[PDB]
Amino acid sequence: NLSEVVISEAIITAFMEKLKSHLETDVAIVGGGPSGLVAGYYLAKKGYRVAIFERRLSIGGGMWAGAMFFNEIVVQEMGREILDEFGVNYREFKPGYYLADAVEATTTIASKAVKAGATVFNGVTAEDVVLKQVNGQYRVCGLVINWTTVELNHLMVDPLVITAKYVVDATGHDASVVSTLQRKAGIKLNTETGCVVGEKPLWASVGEEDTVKNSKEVFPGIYVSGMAANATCGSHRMGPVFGGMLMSGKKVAEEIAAKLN
Amino acid sequence: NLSEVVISEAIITAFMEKLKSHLETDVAIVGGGPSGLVAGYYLAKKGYRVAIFERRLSIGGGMWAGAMFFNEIVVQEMGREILDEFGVNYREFKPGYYLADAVEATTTIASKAVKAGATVFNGVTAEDVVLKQVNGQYRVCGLVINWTTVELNHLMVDPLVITAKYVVDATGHDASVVSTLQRKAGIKLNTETGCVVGEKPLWASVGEEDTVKNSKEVFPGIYVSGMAANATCGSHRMGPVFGGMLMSGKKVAEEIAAKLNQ
Amino acid sequence: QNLSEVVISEAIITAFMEKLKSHLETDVAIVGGGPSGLVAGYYLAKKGYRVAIFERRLSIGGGMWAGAMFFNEIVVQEMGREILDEFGVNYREFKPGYYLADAVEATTTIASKAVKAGATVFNGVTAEDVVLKQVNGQYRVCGLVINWTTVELNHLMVDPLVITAKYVVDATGHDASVVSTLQRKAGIKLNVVGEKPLWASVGEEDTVKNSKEVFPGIYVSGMAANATCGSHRMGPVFGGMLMSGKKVAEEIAAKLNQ
Amino acid sequence: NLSEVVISEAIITAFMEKLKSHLETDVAIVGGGPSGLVAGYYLAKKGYRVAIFERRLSIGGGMWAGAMFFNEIVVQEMGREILDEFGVNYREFKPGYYLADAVEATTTIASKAVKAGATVFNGVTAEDVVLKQVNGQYRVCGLVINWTTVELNHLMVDPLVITAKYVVDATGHDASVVSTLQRKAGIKLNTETGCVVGEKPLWASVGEEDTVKNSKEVFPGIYVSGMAANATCGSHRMGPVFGGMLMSGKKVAEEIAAKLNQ
Amino acid sequence: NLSEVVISEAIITAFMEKLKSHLETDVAIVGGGPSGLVAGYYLAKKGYRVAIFERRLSIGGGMWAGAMFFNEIVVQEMGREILDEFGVNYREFKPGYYLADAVEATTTIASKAVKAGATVFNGVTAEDVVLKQVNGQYRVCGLVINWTTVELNHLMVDPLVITAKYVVDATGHDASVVSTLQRKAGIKLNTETGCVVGEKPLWASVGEEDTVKNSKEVFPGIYVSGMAANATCGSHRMGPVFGGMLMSGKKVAEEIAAKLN
Amino acid sequence: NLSEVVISEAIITAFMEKLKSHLETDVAIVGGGPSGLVAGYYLAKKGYRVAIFERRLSIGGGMWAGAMFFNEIVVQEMGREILDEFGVNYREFKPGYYLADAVEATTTIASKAVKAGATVFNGVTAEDVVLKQVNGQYRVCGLVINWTTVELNHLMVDPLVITAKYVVDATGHDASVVSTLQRKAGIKLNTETGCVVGEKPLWASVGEEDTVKNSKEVFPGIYVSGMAANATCGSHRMGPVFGGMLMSGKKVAEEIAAKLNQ
Ligand SMILES: C/C(=N\CC(=O)O)C(=O)[C@H](O)COP(=O)(O)OP(=O)(O)OC[C@H]1O[C@@H](n2cnc3c(N)ncnc32)[C@H](O)[C@@H]1O
Ligand SMILES: C/C(=N\CC(=O)O)C(=O)[C@H](O)COP(=O)(O)OP(=O)(O)OC[C@H]1O[C@@H](n2cnc3c(N)ncnc32)[C@H](O)[C@@H]1O
Ligand SMILES: C/C(=N\CC(=O)O)C(=O)[C@H](O)COP(=O)(O)OP(=O)(O)OC[C@H]1O[C@@H](n2cnc3c(N)ncnc32)[C@H](O)[C@@H]1O
Ligand SMILES: C/C(=N\CC(=O)O)C(=O)[C@H](O)COP(=O)(O)OP(=O)(O)OC[C@H]1O[C@@H](n2cnc3c(N)ncnc32)[C@H](O)[C@@H]1O
Ligand SMILES: C/C(=N\CC(=O)O)C(=O)[C@H](O)COP(=O)(O)OP(=O)(O)OC[C@H]1O[C@@H](n2cnc3c(N)ncnc32)[C@H](O)[C@@H]1O
Ligand SMILES: C/C(=N\CC(=O)O)C(=O)[C@H](O)COP(=O)(O)OP(=O)(O)OC[C@H]1O[C@@H](n2cnc3c(N)ncnc32)[C@H](O)[C@@H]1O
Ligand SMILES: [Fe+3]
Ligand SMILES: [Fe+3]
Ligand SMILES: [Fe+3]
Ligand SMILES: [Fe+3]
Ligand SMILES: [Fe+3]
Ligand SMILES: [Fe+3]
């Protein structure tokens, strides 16, 4: 009736066509938090080929838990309009403050992002970042990837190499991909200074306005996004308001779409 | 421009409301894996007040990773119609076998269940049931819940309690809730031995057949579905095919739905 | 200032030694400074018995600090309400029969009166075993085998010291650590079945009924009593925790007047 | 008779209102040791609204254990008068040296501080400050809080934010709050340098001297008390003598109470 | 000059043809210790299709370290003739006692086994064992496999299913595959009793003679081998003499080859 | 039939002999990865007394798992001839690119190196060098070795010492031996900074080119090869292509071989 082997063969064949397929993508996003997912949504909407490389088996990052396990997220008016196209239900709590359910937003955003074409590879840690000289200087043009698993158990397993036109570090507070660039290649970042400055303490107002503005190309071929943008640029954090996180992924997507012409 | 205080007010206030309004529910489901989520969808879609208590911050259980991190999940025709009530796109590989992306399927089923009214509490462990004499019967009457971090770190933190009319143990392989029921209370389960028998080795054809059959009331007030059904009744596991797990959830919600219109 | 480091060290050492040596023989040795153990030690010391409490944590209070799920509130019903009044714990009637208390104020106030009342606390100290001596023709618990908690955690080859008591109180909570041990290592029999799932009404009746001398010389109090007399727990209602501690203290004080 | 869902809802309701009514506070104390509790008592005595955020499930910091598990604390004359304001029994060892039972000192100070209105939240780590440019000046205006377990287990759970007119670092040797303030802001503190200098070795005379003197506003909006003050300003540690910790706490409360009438 | 992607594509394509290939093997050996490797050698020599599933990234099991890190192994006369076809150098220490270098024997055995055709999948834990009814009763006819990694980090990752005509539990002291059969299916083993009896304390003489004799089909479709044979049958261990381990893998191979007709 | 005593005698006696006869060697190689093994082969094949000290019980380094547990290793034409001195079978995938099974290649290279006379000590950490003044020069003169379990468990166990005429740091990415050389002794290495520079991000064409170039003497008496060469000199890593690593080992053995016929 039901062959164990057709099933293994099917799982094996599909994943590995899928991974051969994305050995070249236009945009490789690192981190499947909100900003990573929203960026990959819009880029997959505009038709580009988008891979998302997520350290944990699940996507969603720090949105699942809300604040202190109280799984309600807040967005202001900027980002409320992003809860709209993904279709996230929200009611108004006070003028300019829109509550949503943390689980609903995360799964709906993530479902629409993968349905738009963005491939997800979960369990995969972006380890380092391919940089070569292409007509002139050093340019980031790919990712070094391994199983998260391998990383933390400290196993001598060699990585695989994904190549891309643009990398988005949507990796959260730790900004680990641009940190790793910065540290291993010795370069300078477009941050003034030329380093991962480290995120400043909390101020919701300045914090979110800066997240949108910090979402830029800090080195040729690599964009920060979401909370890595505030870590890289040395701006304030904003607590559990997620409007700036969603907005950031949209900004990095349309801007990368702009250069992709 | 923004009051950090207002964001904090709104989160504390909202979650407080969500928790209070589910201290008494029709159906408390334990575990947001494939089968637990589908049961919550259909139970909500039929208009019942449902809460889901999930140990990890992210729902989806063993289904994120397809098999061996190879992001694909196979279903056969049985769960292939379940994949259409949710809008999970798929292709077939060979006749009768279907492939969906594991992440799309997990998040899509997840989204539509919580949109139907399934209220998800993540980072919450169900650690015991409420066991209480009804008309001359011990009956599972609800759950004893704590934060997962309290169990993990062995912190002396007392749990809270919710009441439900039915509890669904959908905790996977662990069969976690019924296992606790049997040892702390010395009751018997509707199984060959009276106990959680434990799953047998792999046989995909019998395993998927026995999952919908074992998804049943095993003691007054509590169902098992999913891998927990096979683990409780002593049937074969099936491997990375998810048609049983999805069908399991629909079957249990319909049976509990019927029982609720007595 | 003129603070001799030598004098501060000598004081701390001299005082603790003499406190420690003066409780090598106590009337009642209580294991566990959670709610029942502290309340039992208050009521016994207020009656003028030498009570020693042995708490594995550096802090007392056990599981009362967190209320439920870190939500710092204690709910007490009829019985525990009037014990709160014995200790001076403020409260507030949510609905008739239910009284809310600050979980931190209850713990620290109960702890404070218990130790002011004469009950001596030894924190950081794990009761590891009991002393079984034959007395009057039967085996009987006659005190404790104690070590540093930190020797148990890091698995260190360090011997215990021995406390002598007329009665021992296992107020260890869900673990029923002392009677489980006695039972496991002697091949005795008690009156440890393990607790049952939650039924808070039988749970708070069953905690006071079950706080009894389950083997010569050793009472069980509080949650330890329910786990031993395999009954139902109760959740974040603390009334029977407070009442059983007073109950055990009355029983023990009565048997000690003979 | 005993309805567990009435119990559950009273706890969920009181606590989450206790938390909302301290999203706004006059003074947020981080650290429920002897210094942080004493400042909390004297501020609450004077009627100001006070929250104390405590990392462990219990308060008491390092006073529980005396020195080397020997449960005795030594105070001199300056601690001696503070023990009498609390009703802590003591005995005189050699002239000008008083020893109290360390369990009695910790639980009594704690009890009276909380009876006077100091609200305490356990299992809650202050992990960062709110920094706001107030009239052209960067000022500490609150705390970023999370559950302790979330930091231990490295969970991706966002914080809640409270707001305060004054923050007291009373985190003992670690000087946790002012330490993260400096490295993440890059600011400078009222010392010779910035950040925390780190404590010197031991010299009880100078160590106790300097605790009283270093309990200061080291940056607008945040004070340091107790050993965080010695650590921040780089003075000597005193041994297991707690006179300076208690007096440190009382100084910071009277100083902050002054500034709260301006 | 040198494309990062042809390299990833090559590693991806080859492994996954290789794993599609062995979704059916004649014999799936669990454990790449000496007995597992010697069995797969001879079965691959006789032309059968042999997969080896090894929990650790390296093969060799407990042979690498010799005894107490003193990396010299001993074989008696039985097994000396097995050091011959693999070509392991050995000098005679005393009549009937042949020393070999632990690293040399392990790598040479393992190289000749993989060169004979035995495929190795390392990092792969055999988790459970497919049993179905095939004309009559329950028969072991495959393996449930996952990444070792997954197992120990306790990650909810589903396994894959390999199907085979015969399974060899060459898994060492722990006999984990037949233990897992025995415990999950409730069956009885051909051991008298019907359980993993557990290995007896040490006696070199009886221990090694029993290893050869205990290497049998303890349940339809599954063979023990090497040190799992002594664990399953309740016989003595033999210390760091490895002659019986090598002999056992040969016996299980020619006997399984016999039934494969 | 058998004397357990005789087996134990023969193991203790044999290993004792093997250890003693290598307390003084021509070349002590640290690390039995791809590049370390190939260098030991060619150095033995040319008749020099070689010892290899490998931290783990199994040689082979990062090469067992090909890439991401996908058991295949790519080499280009450069290491494609190296694969023939050992008899590692391969196919080509696209022109100039070759695939060998990672397990066959690892064990085959390993077998032939130890058969050529390379004596392998596994479970042994090189933790320091011997540094000793020769004709008016500090020169690496040998190694300080301990059991890996002593380092892992932080046991107070003193090491032993071997002497060699050349030490080859082939410890992969860690560049473990030269890193210790630089910090404990304050020497400089033949590199841009004088220090272990650290590897740069990935560039497979330059990475493999720079590996044979950086496989050189970096301080009197010690070479680097393999990934340690790239890590010490600050070049690009290359990913899962092993032609540099094999060529690296042959180059270093030839250079050390020449230097040894001064
Ligand atoms: C608003 C806020 N903080 C404000 C405040 O604290 O005041 C938050 O914390 C938000 O969650 C931040 O949103 P954002 O999308 O920027 O990040 P996230 O949710 O933390 O997602 C990051 C993702 O990136 C993953 N990740 C990490 N590092 C790697 C790696 N090398 N390779 C692959 N993935 C990696 C990681 O698993 C995670 O899922
Ligand atoms: C097909 C298959 N196996 C076949 C095979 O192996 O051969 C699978 O693994 C499927 O994923 C099984 O799906 P199913 O929905 O039955 O279970 P799951 O995916 O493992 O999810 C169960 C959920 O329950 C959670 N959970 C556990 N215990 C508790 C607890 N006390 N309280 C709250 N939640 C808990 C747990 O985190 C998990 O998320
Ligand atoms: C009502 C309720 N639960 C209902 C429910 O969950 O459904 C509770 O949990 C209450 O907090 C229980 O109150 P109770 O006083 O019975 O127990 P507790 O708070 O856990 O205190 C036990 C004390 O005993 C300590 N302890 C443990 N074992 C030893 C040992 N061998 N030696 C010395 N001390 C030990 C331990 O650290 C602790 O302080
Ligand atoms: C006299 C002496 N030392 C002298 C010497 O060693 O020679 C002492 O140890 C005294 O006990 C010092 O008393 P003091 O009140 O200054 O500090 P403490 O007892 O150590 O308590 C600080 C409290 O602060 C808590 N805490 C820490 N960090 C955080 C954080 N980020 N957030 C929330 N709470 C936190 C922490 O759990 C602790 O309870
Ligand atoms: C002679 C002796 N002892 C005598 C004495 O002590 O007196 C020995 O220890 C010999 O090494 C035994 O040789 P043998 O080939 O029988 O076993 P081994 O060397 O221990 O190899 C077992 C292999 O099996 C592996 N393994 C384990 N369990 C699993 C699993 N579920 N799935 C996949 N692989 C697994 C494991 O990694 C290992 O490599
Ligand atoms: C191609 C590639 N990377 C490219 C990329 O990532 O992009 C690789 O990983 C290759 O495997 C590198 O081969 P190479 O022979 O250079 O190094 P390796 O395989 O990692 O082996 C080094 C050996 O050295 C061992 N070792 C470490 N440190 C010590 C120590 N102090 N003492 C004794 N041995 C030690 C260690 O166990 C290991 O076995
Ligand atoms: Fe590498
Ligand atoms: Fe409890
Ligand atoms: Fe002893
Ligand atoms: Fe955050
Ligand atoms: Fe499963
Ligand atoms: Fe030394």
Author numbering:
A (entry chain A), E (entry chain A): 3 to 263
B (entry chain D), D (entry chain B), F (entry chain D): 3 to 264
C (entry chain C): 2 to 192, 198 to 264
Sentences from the paper on this structure:
In contrast, THI4s that use sulfide mediate multiple turnovers, i.e. are true catalysts. The crystal structure of the aerotolerant bacterial Thermovibrio ammonificans THI4 was determined to probe the molecular basis of aerotolerance. We conclude that catalytic THI4s can indeed operate aerobically and that the metal cofactor inserted is a likely natural determinant of aerotolerance.
In common with the methanogen THI4s, TaTHI4 is an overall homooctamer with four monomers per asymmetric unit. The monomer structure consists of a long α-helix (residues 6–24) and a barrel-like core domain sandwiched by helix bundles. The enzyme active site lies in a channel formed by two helix bundles and is capped by a loop from an adjoining monomer. Clear density for the TaTHI4 treated with NAD and glycine shows the expected glycine imine intermediate in the active site. Based on our reconstitution conditions, the bound metal in the active site can be assigned as ferrous iron, Fe(II). The iron is co-ordinated in a pseudooctahedral geometry with three sites occupied by the pincer-type ligand of the bound glycine imine, axial ligands of His175 and Asp160, and a predicted water molecule. Notable differences are two extended loop regions in TaTHI4 at the entrance to the large active-site pore (residues 134–142 and 186–197); however, based on the pore diameter, these changes are unlikely to affect O2 diffusion. The ligand geometry in the structure does not preclude other metals, including Co(II) or Ni(II). In summary, the comparative genomics, functional complementation, and structural evidence collectively implicate the bound metal as a natural determinant of THI4 aerotolerance, with Co(II) the best candidate although Ni(II) cannot be rigorously excluded.
